[PDB]
């Protein structure tokens, strides 16, 4: 059945588009409405050097959710 949850491919993705602005904070989410992610370097993990970070160890993810998408 349909998953209904963000996949790894597309956080991923938001990963390489904010890479820039990456941190310990928490990013904006990753759409402006509906369903999306928002990520940041683990606590522990802010000594790493940024090539370098472990996609499941060292990035934290949640779901964040926006507004309605309008037509």
Known sequence: YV???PSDKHI???LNK???SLSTEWS????????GIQVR????SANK????LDY??????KICKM???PH
């Open 3 to 5: 998953e209904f949850e």
């Open 12 to 14: 991923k993705e938001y």
């Open 18 to 20: 904010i890479q820039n």
């Open 28 to 35: 904006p989410c990753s759409v402006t409405c509906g369903n």
């Open 41 to 44: 370097i683990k606590p522990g």
């Open 49 to 52: 050097p940024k090539d370098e």
């Open 56 to 61: 499941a160890n060292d990035i934290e993810k």
């Open 67 to 69: 507004e309605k998408c």
